[PDB]
Design an enzyme around this catalytic site. Sequence first.
Site, PDB file in Angstrom:
ATOM      1  N   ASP A   1      -4.167  10.117 -13.257  1.00  0.00           N
ATOM      2  CA  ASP A   1      -3.999  10.143 -11.818  1.00  0.00           C
ATOM      3  C   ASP A   1      -4.457  11.174 -10.912  1.00  0.00           C
ATOM      4  O   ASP A   1      -3.897  12.335 -10.663  1.00  0.00           O
ATOM      5  CB  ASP A   1      -2.266  10.049 -11.756  1.00  0.00           C
ATOM      6  CG  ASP A   1      -1.630   9.538 -10.438  1.00  0.00           C
ATOM      7  OD1 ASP A   1      -2.218   9.946  -9.500  1.00  0.00           O
ATOM      8  OD2 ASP A   1      -0.684   9.086 -10.570  1.00  0.00           O
ATOM      9  N   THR A   2      -5.498  10.896  -9.964  1.00  0.00           N
ATOM     10  CA  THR A   2      -6.193  11.970  -9.224  1.00  0.00           C
ATOM     11  C   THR A   2      -5.286  11.718  -7.853  1.00  0.00           C
ATOM     12  O   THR A   2      -5.381  12.632  -7.081  1.00  0.00           O
ATOM     13  CB  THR A   2      -7.334  11.168  -8.596  1.00  0.00           C
ATOM     14  OG1 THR A   2      -7.304   9.722  -8.008  1.00  0.00           O
ATOM     15  CG2 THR A   2      -8.459  10.962  -9.710  1.00  0.00           C
ATOM     16  N   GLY A   3      -4.140  11.020  -8.123  1.00  0.00           N
ATOM     17  CA  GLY A   3      -3.290  10.943  -6.853  1.00  0.00           C
ATOM     18  C   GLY A   3      -2.073  11.837  -6.800  1.00  0.00           C
ATOM     19  O   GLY A   3      -1.273  12.139  -6.261  1.00  0.00           O
TER      20      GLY A   3
HETATM   21  C1  LIG Z   1       3.340  12.863  -9.914  1.00  0.00           C
HETATM   22  C2  LIG Z   1       3.803  13.846  -8.695  1.00  0.00           C
HETATM   23  C3  LIG Z   1       3.252  15.204  -8.543  1.00  0.00           C
HETATM   24  C4  LIG Z   1       5.162  13.767  -8.541  1.00  0.00           C
HETATM   25  N1  LIG Z   1       3.029  13.199  -7.446  1.00  0.00           N
HETATM   26  C5  LIG Z   1       3.227  12.068  -7.224  1.00  0.00           C
HETATM   27  O1  LIG Z   1       3.853  11.101  -7.741  1.00  0.00           O
HETATM   28  C6  LIG Z   1       2.437  11.516  -6.037  1.00  0.00           C
HETATM   29  C7  LIG Z   1       3.093  11.635  -4.738  1.00  0.00           C
HETATM   30  C8  LIG Z   1       2.226  11.519  -3.581  1.00  0.00           C
HETATM   31  C9  LIG Z   1       2.979  11.809  -2.213  1.00  0.00           C
HETATM   32  C10 LIG Z   1       4.031  10.739  -1.854  1.00  0.00           C
HETATM   33  C11 LIG Z   1       3.398   9.442  -1.953  1.00  0.00           C
HETATM   34  C12 LIG Z   1       2.639   9.293  -3.319  1.00  0.00           C
HETATM   35  C13 LIG Z   1       1.863  10.412  -3.368  1.00  0.00           C
HETATM   36  C14 LIG Z   1       1.106   9.815  -4.839  1.00  0.00           C
HETATM   37  N2  LIG Z   1       1.883  10.025  -5.821  1.00  0.00           N
HETATM   38  C15 LIG Z   1       1.143   9.934  -7.266  1.00  0.00           C
HETATM   39  C16 LIG Z   1       1.028   8.391  -7.221  1.00  0.00           C
HETATM   40  O2  LIG Z   1      -0.364   8.089  -8.348  1.00  0.00           O
HETATM   41  C17 LIG Z   1       2.033   7.393  -8.072  1.00  0.00           C
HETATM   42  C18 LIG Z   1       1.890   7.871  -9.391  1.00  0.00           C
HETATM   43  C19 LIG Z   1       2.819   6.653 -10.123  1.00  0.00           C
HETATM   44  C20 LIG Z   1       2.516   5.950 -10.981  1.00  0.00           C
HETATM   45  C21 LIG Z   1       3.469   5.313 -11.855  1.00  0.00           C
HETATM   46  C22 LIG Z   1       4.884   5.550 -11.421  1.00  0.00           C
HETATM   47  C23 LIG Z   1       5.361   6.426 -10.506  1.00  0.00           C
HETATM   48  C24 LIG Z   1       4.289   7.036  -9.837  1.00  0.00           C
HETATM   49  N3  LIG Z   1       1.689   6.068  -7.914  1.00  0.00           N
HETATM   50  C25 LIG Z   1       2.722   5.329  -7.137  1.00  0.00           C
HETATM   51  O3  LIG Z   1       3.624   5.771  -6.277  1.00  0.00           O
HETATM   52  C26 LIG Z   1       2.315   3.823  -7.064  1.00  0.00           C
HETATM   53  C27 LIG Z   1       2.832   3.118  -5.741  1.00  0.00           C
HETATM   54  C28 LIG Z   1       1.839   1.957  -5.711  1.00  0.00           C
HETATM   55  N4  LIG Z   1       0.696   1.843  -6.243  1.00  0.00           N
HETATM   56  O4  LIG Z   1       2.276   0.816  -4.968  1.00  0.00           O
HETATM   57  N5  LIG Z   1       2.943   3.308  -8.453  1.00  0.00           N
HETATM   58  C29 LIG Z   1       2.348   2.240  -9.050  1.00  0.00           C
HETATM   59  O5  LIG Z   1       1.358   2.109  -8.784  1.00  0.00           O
HETATM   60  C30 LIG Z   1       3.245   1.952 -10.130  1.00  0.00           C
HETATM   61  C31 LIG Z   1       2.771   1.110 -11.255  1.00  0.00           C
HETATM   62  C32 LIG Z   1       3.468   0.692 -12.208  1.00  0.00           C
HETATM   63  C33 LIG Z   1       4.847   1.046 -12.243  1.00  0.00           C
HETATM   64  C34 LIG Z   1       5.569   0.583 -13.196  1.00  0.00           C
HETATM   65  C35 LIG Z   1       7.035   0.714 -13.410  1.00  0.00           C
HETATM   66  C36 LIG Z   1       7.437   1.340 -12.257  1.00  0.00           C
HETATM   67  C37 LIG Z   1       6.860   2.000 -11.150  1.00  0.00           C
HETATM   68  C38 LIG Z   1       5.531   1.531 -11.084  1.00  0.00           C
HETATM   69  N6  LIG Z   1       4.520   1.984 -10.107  1.00  0.00           N
END
Ligand SMILES: CC(C)(C)NC(=O)[C@@H]1C[C@@H]2CCCC[C@@H]2CN1C[C@@H](O)[C@H](Cc1ccccc1)NC(=O)[C@H](CC(N)=O)NC(=O)c1ccc2ccccc2n1
Length: 198
Positions: free
Chosen positions: A124-126
């Site tokens: 996760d580069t995000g």
């Molecule tokens: C890990 C942490 C340090 C908390 N950082 C983050 O979480 C940051 C916060 C940032 C600021 C707010 C907006 C989002 C960004 C990116 N995120 C990371 C970012 O990469 C985050 C990682 C993630 C993946 C899966 C489940 C939950 C969370 N992805 C997402 O939020 C994306 C949203 C989307 N693509 O529609 N979620 C998903 O792609 C995704 C995929 C599968 C899933 C299965 C079950 C439940 C949820 C699921 N969500």
Amino acid sequence: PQVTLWQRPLVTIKIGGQLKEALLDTGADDTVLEEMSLPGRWKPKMIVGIGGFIKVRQYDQILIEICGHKAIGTVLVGPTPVNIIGRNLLTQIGFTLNFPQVTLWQRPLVTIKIGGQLKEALLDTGADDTVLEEMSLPGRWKPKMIVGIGGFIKVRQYDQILIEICGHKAIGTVLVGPTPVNIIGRNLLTQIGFTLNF
Ligand SMILES: CC(C)(C)NC(=O)[C@@H]1C[C@@H]2CCCC[C@@H]2CN1C[C@@H](O)[C@H](Cc1ccccc1)NC(=O)[C@H](CC(N)=O)NC(=O)c1ccc2ccccc2n1
């Protein structure tokens, strides 16, 4: 066209006649943007991620120009502290995750070894941090709290935790919580030499 993860991977995007900065998120399936003015009709889809959920309006066949490369696909719009370029568009504009090379047509999963246990985790580069599902982890921690899209979650901040990801080592800080997916964030990603390409 290589990009390192030492800093957040942000790019300039032209969408809806306007300009925004966004994060390239190999950890997001979908592209979601702050509340902006986009024309056309949409769909009341709901998106999910750590901290909880958020509702957004779904657009299709929207044109977006990322770092001067055109792409068309589904952009989503709702309350996000960050503009996010997810995998639907990264695949298109040609982004590859290298370290040999991982495509984004599927979720970038690796098997990591941590605390003598084997897990599957998301590259996760995000994410700036590495957050693992609730597990047994010896040592000592501190009670840090963190935030995503649908809100915030409490997690245990162990430090100096060792991990083997896809057959390389790295010692660093790991967090443990109620997250539905294991997340390998940019802090461990930088130590194992993952980069983004066009
Ligand atoms: C890990 C942490 C340090 C908390 N950082 C983050 O979480 C940051 C916060 C940032 C600021 C707010 C907006 C989002 C960004 C990116 N995120 C990371 C970012 O990469 C985050 C990682 C993630 C993946 C899966 C489940 C939950 C969370 N992805 C997402 O939020 C994306 C949203 C989307 N693509 O529609 N979620 C998903 O792609 C995704 C995929 C599968 C899933 C299965 C079950 C439940 C949820 C699921 N969500």
